[PDB]
Amino acid sequence: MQGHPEVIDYLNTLLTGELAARDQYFIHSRMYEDWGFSKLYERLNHEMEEETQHADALLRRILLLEGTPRMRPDDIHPGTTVPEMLEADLKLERHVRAALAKGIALCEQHKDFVSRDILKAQLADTEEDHAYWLEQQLGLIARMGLENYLQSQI
């Protein structure tokens, strides 16, 4: 099916952002594991797998619309401490949230309602699983202190 060149281009933009998020979680999860925080490792490993499904859904949708997917992830910027890692992930999902919202309006505008629903599904994940869980972790650090928090994540 030949999709709208603007829609395809912006799915591609979203795709390189999802490939990035996948890779940022890949490195963060393994950093968490190396440091001995199994619970952060398991959660970031899970988010890595979800980002991989978000990427997959965009990639297949671009192929269906007869586009050529852009496979280079955006640049990632990993933290070097637990608080910087959480903050770097929160900044990434904030950016992804804003990109998706704009894609959603753009799909409405070109009357690509199926691409729009794909983006809306991913936006719910970004807001309600990923972004909310991150704010939650920063919230715990704020409430019990970093040391107590990190103990709880072993």
- Per the annotation, where are the binding residues for Fe(3+)? 18, 46-47, 50-51, 54, 93, 129-130
Cβ-in-10-Å burial (0-12, 13-18, 19+) of 17 comes to: buried
Nearest to Fe ion of 126, 137 (CB atom): 126
CA dist., res. 130 & res. 38, Å (int): 18
**Rounded to whole angstroms, how far apart are CA atoms 54 and 104?**
15
Token pair listed for 92: 């990434």
Residues near its own copies (CB under 8 A) are 1, 19, 23-24, 26-27, 30-31, 33-36, 55-56, 59-60, 63-64, 69, 71-73, 75-76, 78, 82, 97, 101, 104-105, 111, 113-114, 117, 120, 123-124, 127-128, 131-132, 135-137, 139-140, 143-145, 147-152, 154
